Write a protein that binds this DNA or RNA. Structure first.
Ligand SMILES: [K+]
Ligand SMILES: [K+]
Ligand SMILES: [K+]
Ligand SMILES: [K+]
Ligand SMILES: [K+]
Ligand SMILES: [K+]
Ligand SMILES: [K+]
Ligand SMILES: [K+]
Ligand SMILES: [Mg+2]
Ligand SMILES: [Mg+2]
Ligand SMILES: [Mg+2]
Ligand SMILES: [Mg+2]
Ligand SMILES: [Mg+2]
Ligand SMILES: [Mg+2]
Ligand SMILES: [Mg+2]
Ligand SMILES: [Mg+2]
Ligand SMILES: [Mg+2]
Ligand SMILES: [Mg+2]
Ligand SMILES: [Mg+2]
Ligand SMILES: [Mg+2]
Ligand SMILES: [Mg+2]
Ligand SMILES: [Mg+2]
Ligand SMILES: [Mg+2]
Ligand SMILES: [Mg+2]
Ligand SMILES: [Mg+2]
Ligand SMILES: [Mg+2]
Ligand SMILES: [Mg+2]
Ligand SMILES: [Mg+2]
Ligand SMILES: [Mg+2]
Ligand SMILES: [Mg+2]
Ligand SMILES: [Mg+2]
Ligand SMILES: [Mg+2]
Ligand SMILES: [Mg+2]
Ligand SMILES: [Mg+2]
Ligand SMILES: [Mg+2]
Ligand SMILES: [Mg+2]
Ligand code: NA
Ligand code: NA
Ligand code: NA
Ligand code: NA
Lengths: 122, 129, 208, 218, 89, 103, 71, 32
RNA sequence: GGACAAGUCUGGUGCCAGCACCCGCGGUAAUUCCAGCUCCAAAAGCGUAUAUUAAUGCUGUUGCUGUUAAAGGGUUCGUAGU
RNA sequence: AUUCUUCAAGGAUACCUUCCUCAAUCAAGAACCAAAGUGUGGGGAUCAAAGAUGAUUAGAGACCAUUGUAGUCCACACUGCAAACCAUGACACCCAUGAAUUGGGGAACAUCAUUUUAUUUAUCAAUUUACGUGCCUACUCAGCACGUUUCUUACUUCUUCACGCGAAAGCUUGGAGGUUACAGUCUCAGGGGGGAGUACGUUCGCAAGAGUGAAACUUAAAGA
């Protein structure tokens, strides 16, 4: 079998997090970078770490990966999410008119507020 | 069949207080039941209760304030001489500092502390604390 | 709710009723439990349960008055394992100043004292008693009261203050948290009651 | 070398919460045995080991032997604690039992038999504790009649501070582990019984964790 | 004045436990499900003033699922929750 | 030690006195009807290969007319239902699944 | 579960009389049968004449000769 | 097996063995 | 040795002789036998046997147990009794 | 446990009918009681104790195969021995939750017929009572089912059932709960394991058997 152990997988995630820029989808250039920024002794381990890092870069180019959490990608994601529409969704729904049921109408008619405006049965 | 109205009523009250209820319904009622409840109420263990009339043996609704730990009847109604109060207190009461044993005497139904003051014996009915 | 002098403030207005109806916050499920049966006001022909709007508002204000009495807002934590509520609790904690826990609840967060993520809240708010069952069970070991948003089929063990509402639906959850945040700020001096709040409810919506 | 990890520990480490009664009032759990060490004066804790026996688990090629130890702790009057732990060595099990005993510490109520002259000397009411098949019953006794109990419960009652009691037992009391726990449960129950002297309402108070909210949030 | 007293006016109890506001039962020191809830008072304007109302719940009520019903009863009795909706003007 | 609350059959107390026995489909052992393991089996008369070859020769089933089937209600004794792997022993806290219907 | 009757003294007395024969300790002291089978006539000691010296082997886990006598 | 240790032969067959013993005693006493 | 207060002492014997109310000890290093020296209990007293009371909520009125440990009659009717 | 025709019963439900403690449980006593078994007449297809033959096996008086008598079935008399079990005595009270089900009734469908108040309120509400479908004379019918909401009786389930209890397995409106905080009423059994449900005596039975029921001795455990 060719399963990568947890020592290899943990190191590869750390390298991609710290040196995402200057890494690409080529094993041979990624290997030179890995040897530069890794202190470990085994040459076999460093080859496996470069291999799994190249695998992650290929995955990242098509979609997010659950364990990476890049800073720049996260910041742009937050900015996109915090979008404020011109008109609130609740305001647009009220202006369109609200339809209720007979049971809901009966409950509203017995309250101190009464049936509010923009409320029609059907 | 039901053989003791007093025992049935005291079991309903003790069961309800164990479950932490606020009110309990008792059926059927009787003169002895009402007198027993009046002794408990005078010492502050139950509170207000009401009797409903139905042209038969009535019904009682009792309000509970959460101060009653246990009540129960004693069957059969053993005779108690005026010098035997300490024996019953030692046997069926948590301590000598609180709790009452209810007796029926020729002067009426009363707790054991009042009976000692009037120097009368009788027959043991029950207890509460 | 009521106050010491019957000032008739804090009562729900026409606009608040409109927001609840527009977001379908009054629509329950078809099932029903014994504990939740007192909050149900009628049932539609389809089988849906209608929640009593008056009871929903009274419980919501009671929850707000409990939260507003905590000196340190970090002593209140909001939890949610449902996907639709993770965004809402994030915005809620940002506005009010509380802590939050989204996703899977790690067991032992409130009981294992030697871990690095040990937490000791004073008040707990959860989105769903059924899915947030682990948080409620832990709160019953370390003396923590619980506020919960409940649907018509929810179990009420370890729940202290239940707010009956629609627990499912991205719009319904967001509106309930938006209403609770606005009331807590109003009970403080932060925002006035005479001017509509400028924060849009769409910020609380869950987005992919 | 103690670094508290709970809000209660930080309050006790500073000179706040000067008594165990503050903790007992609000039912807070105790998760650091250094709290009890600080809140009870030196020369009064008075712990002792009650029972240590081996337990075995069958394995392929033999069995594994461990040691379970029981410990009792308690000041002169009103406090008692019992703990039991397992370890690979007798010394390791004994040390772990002392910590467990301190963590589970409860107050004991005391009262009078007939006349309230000097000081509480007996238990106020009849109590019963049950663990396994063992049930232990404690009955108030008059002054002078001392601790009428078997050697195992007698040692626990002395540490709790009780002076006069009658004792009854039922079940298989030769199981010393259940005998020790049943006595502890009976003494725990003394503060859960509502008597007419406690009817007169109560006054609310703030918990330590919010009275000192500003100090903790640091 | 709560507690047991000597022949002279000396209180000889270690401490006085809390009582549940719903069941009038003592709250022990080994009961870790008991809770205390504080509700803030509100000025004529919707702003808290600094005082609170405190409720104590036994703890076995919480385990059995009756704490929500009990708190409802207590809040109505204390004058915090309105029992029913108002009438139309 | 009581293994099952219903004791392996479908006869509650205070419901019946006696249930008539039936013969096991395999060994002819007599077993009460409510205790036996019963299955309703619908079997095709021919497999796919043989059915195709018969249909070419037949003028009736040659154009979209169903071939007949075999219907049987088989009741097993407990020993025969286990040895034939109709049922198997199940873990505790799993013995309580019921499967009221097919599949 | 017993009567508890207040006029059922006869039933309780009869119940205890019948059930007291079920323990060996009470029955042995009240039956006069063990006394007749006892070589001593209910006494603590007796005198006799020695007939033979015998050796009795010990029970299985032990192993010895016990040096008894026939009287 | 559905029963705990009997400590002997099967109780049904032990009962039958005593069953046959009682007949032989009855016949032997009949001869006198 | 334990229950049960008091020796990981020194010789002899070697599943023998013996001890041991019960659990158990004795086949070559016996904490138990036969002895020496020390030590323990209570003491002008102290062992052993048999009977009896308490231990015993193992006869249970106060106060037992009856699904699986011993123990609910195969089912109804029914008199005395309660 | 097929259908039809008959005979006498039984429970539940409905009722502004009648009566007025007439009841609960029970030594003695009575009736009924699976299969096997017994007696006298019928009947005899199937299966099949005993027996026979063939295999298998070291052996095989067994399991497998082919047979085969009594029995298995009916009528009239006996017997009274079951893991006759829910291994759980009868009567009475309280008791949390969600889905179902068997019988009866009410609402609905169908058929006929033609309270004050209340401008200034609220602490335990003065009316949540809502809702449709299919079949149906060119009559066991003003009928039959279904859908929705209540009620009384019965057998149950929770794998999305609460206290409490128990040595535990487990029980839980139907308790094994409401019990050292030990008392609703009556009755039947048990007191370490064996010897033994044996011996002797006596009652019942055609027999087979059934009921009642010891001791001498022997054991440190047996059991859950
Ligand atoms: K089955
Ligand atoms: K087996
Ligand atoms: K030697
Ligand atoms: K017993
Ligand atoms: K015959
Ligand atoms: K055959
Ligand atoms: K029998
Ligand atoms: K029926
Ligand atoms: Mg004892
Ligand atoms: Mg039936
Ligand atoms: Mg049967
Ligand atoms: Mg088995
Ligand atoms: Mg058995
Ligand atoms: Mg010795
Ligand atoms: Mg010693
Ligand atoms: Mg002796
Ligand atoms: Mg030596
Ligand atoms: Mg004696
Ligand atoms: Mg005694
Ligand atoms: Mg048995
Ligand atoms: Mg029976
Ligand atoms: Mg048929
Ligand atoms: Mg027959
Ligand atoms: Mg014939
Ligand atoms: Mg035969
Ligand atoms: Mg054969
Ligand atoms: Mg044949
Ligand atoms: Mg026949
Ligand atoms: Mg039986
Ligand atoms: Mg038991
Ligand atoms: Mg039992
Ligand atoms: Mg009793
Ligand atoms: Mg015996
Ligand atoms: Mg004869
Ligand atoms: Mg014959
Ligand atoms: Mg016989
Ligand atoms: Na005795
Ligand atoms: Na046959
Ligand atoms: Na059975
Ligand atoms: Na149930």
């Amino acid at each position: 079998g060719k399963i990568r152990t947890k020592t290899v997988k943990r190191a590869s995630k750390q390298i991609v997090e710290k040196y995402f820029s200057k890494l690409n989808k080529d094993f041979y250039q990624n290997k030179r970078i890995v040897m530069d920024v890794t202190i470990a002794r085994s040459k076999k381990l460093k080859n496996k770490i470069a291999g799994y890092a190249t695998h992650i870069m290929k995955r990242l180019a098509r979609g997010p990966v659950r364990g990476i959490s890049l800073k720049l990608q996260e910041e742009e994601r937050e900015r996109r999410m915090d979008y404020v529409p011109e008109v609130s969704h609740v305001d647009q729904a009220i202006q369109d008119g609200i339809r209720v049921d007979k049971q809901t109408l009966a409950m509203l008619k017995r309250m101190e507020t009464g049936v509010p405006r923009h409320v029609l049965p059907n | 069949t039901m053989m003791s109205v007093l025992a049935n009523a005291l079991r309903c009250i003790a069961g309800a207080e164990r479950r932490g209820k606020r009110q309990v319904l008792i059926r059927p009622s009787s003169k002895v039941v009402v007198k027993f409840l009046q002794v408990m109420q005078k010492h502050g263990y139950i509170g207000e209760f009401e009797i409903v009339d139905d042209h038969r043996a009535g019904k009682i609704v009792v309000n509970l304030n959460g101060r009653l730990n246990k009540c129960g009847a004693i069957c059969p109604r053993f005779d108690c001489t005026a010098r035997d109060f300490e024996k019953w207190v030692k046997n069926i009461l948590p301590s000598r500092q609180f709790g009452f044993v209810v007796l029926t005497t020729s002067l009426g139904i009363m707790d054991h502390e009042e009976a000692r003051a009037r120097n009368t014996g009788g027959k043991v009915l029950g207890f509460f604390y | 709710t009521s106050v010491s002098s019957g000032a008739k403030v804090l009562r729900m207005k026409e606009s608040d009723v409109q927001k609840l109806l527009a977001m379908h916050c009054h629509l329950g499920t078809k099932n029903s439990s014994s504990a939740m049966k007192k909050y149900i006001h009628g049932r539609t022909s389809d089988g849906t349960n209608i929640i009593d709007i008056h009871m929903t508002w009274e419980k919501l204000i009671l929850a707000a008055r409990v939260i507003a009495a905590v000196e340190n807002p970090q002593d209140v934590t909001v939890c949610s394992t449902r996907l639709f509520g993770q965004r809402a609790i994030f915005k809620f904690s940002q506005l009010v100043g509380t802590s939050f826990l989204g996703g899977r609840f790690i067991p032992g967060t409130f009981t294992n004292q030697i871990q690095k993520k040990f937490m000791q809240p004073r008040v707990l708010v959860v989105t769903d008693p059924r899915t947030d069952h682990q948080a409620l069970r832990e709160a019953s070991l370390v003396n923590i009261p619980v506020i919960a948003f409940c649907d018509t089929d929810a179990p009420l063990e370890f729940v202290d203050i239940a707010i009956p509402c629609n627990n499912r639906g991205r719009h319904s959850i967001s509106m309930m948290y938006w209403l609770l945040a606005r009331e807590v700020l109003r009970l403080r001096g932060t925002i006035p009651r005479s001017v509509p709040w400028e924060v849009k409810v769409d910020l609380f919506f869950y987005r992919d | 070398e103690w670094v508290p990890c709970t809000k209660l520990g930080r309050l006790v480490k500073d000179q706040k919460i000067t008594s165990l009664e503050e903790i007992f009032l609000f039912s807070m759990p105790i998760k650091e045995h250094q709290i009890v060490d600080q809140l009870i004066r030196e020369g009064d804790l008075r712990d002792e080991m009650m029972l240590v026996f081996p337990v075995q688990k069958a394995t392929s090629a033999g069995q594994r032997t461990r040691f379970k130890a029981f410990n009792v702790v308690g000041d002169g009057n009103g406090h008692i604690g019992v703990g039991a732990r397992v370890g690979k060595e007798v010394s390791l099990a004994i040390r772990a039992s002392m910590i467990a005993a301190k963590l589970s510490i409860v107050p004991v109520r005391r009262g009078y038999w007939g006349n309230k002259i000097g000081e509480p000397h007996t238990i106020p009411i009849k109590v019963t504790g049950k663990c396994g098949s063992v049930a232990v019953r404690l009955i108030p006794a008059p002054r002078g009649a001392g601790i009428v109990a078997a050697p195992v419960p007698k040692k626990i009652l002395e540490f709790a501070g009780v002076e006069d009691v009658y004792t009854s037992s039922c079940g298989k009391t030769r199981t010393r582990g259940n005998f020790i726990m049943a006595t502890f449960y009976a003494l725990r129950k003394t503060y859960g019984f509502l008597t007419p002297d406690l009817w007169a309402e109560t006054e609310v108070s703030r918990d330590p964790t919010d009275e000192h909210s500003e100090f903790l949030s640091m | 004045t709560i507690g047991t007293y000597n022949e002279e006016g000396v209180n000889v109890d270690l401490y006085i436990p809390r009582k549940c506001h719903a069941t009038n039962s003592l709250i022990t020191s080994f009961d870790h499900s008991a809770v205390q809830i504080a509700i803030a008072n509100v000025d004529p304007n919707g702003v808290i003033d600094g005082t609170t109302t405190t409720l104590c719940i036994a703890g076995y009520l919480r385990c059995q699922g009756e704490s929500d019903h009990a708190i409802n009863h207590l809040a109505i009795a204390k004058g915090i929750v309105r029992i029913k909706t108002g009438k139309k003007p | 030690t009581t293994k099952r609350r219903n004791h392996g059959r479908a006869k509650p107390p205070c419901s019946r006195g006696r249930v008539r026995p039936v013969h096991c489909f395999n060994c002819s052992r007599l077993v009460p009807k409510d205790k036996s393991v019963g299955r309703f089996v619908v079997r095709r008369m021919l497999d796919q290969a043989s059915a195709r070859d018969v249909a070419e020769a037949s003028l009736i089933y040659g154009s979209g007319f169903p071939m007949p089937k075999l219907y049987m209600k088989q009741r097993y004794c407990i020993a025969c239902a286990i040895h034939s792997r109709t049922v198997r022993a199940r873990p505790v806290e799993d013995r309580k699944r019921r499967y009221t219907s097919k599949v | 579960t017993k009567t508890n009757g207040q006029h059922a003294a006869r039933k309780l007395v009869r119940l205890r009389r019948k059930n007291r024969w079920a323990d060996k300790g009470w029955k042995k002291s009240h039956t006069f049968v063990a006394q007749k089978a006892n070589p001593f006539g209910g006494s603590s000691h007796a005198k006799g004449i020695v007939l033979e010296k015998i050796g009795v082997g010990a029970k299985q886990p032990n192993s010895a000769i016990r040096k008894c006598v026939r009287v | 097996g559905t029963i705990s240790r009997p400590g002997g032969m099967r109780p049904k067959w032990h009962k039958k063995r005593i069953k046959r013993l009682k007949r032989r005693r009855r016949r032997m006493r009949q001869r006198s």
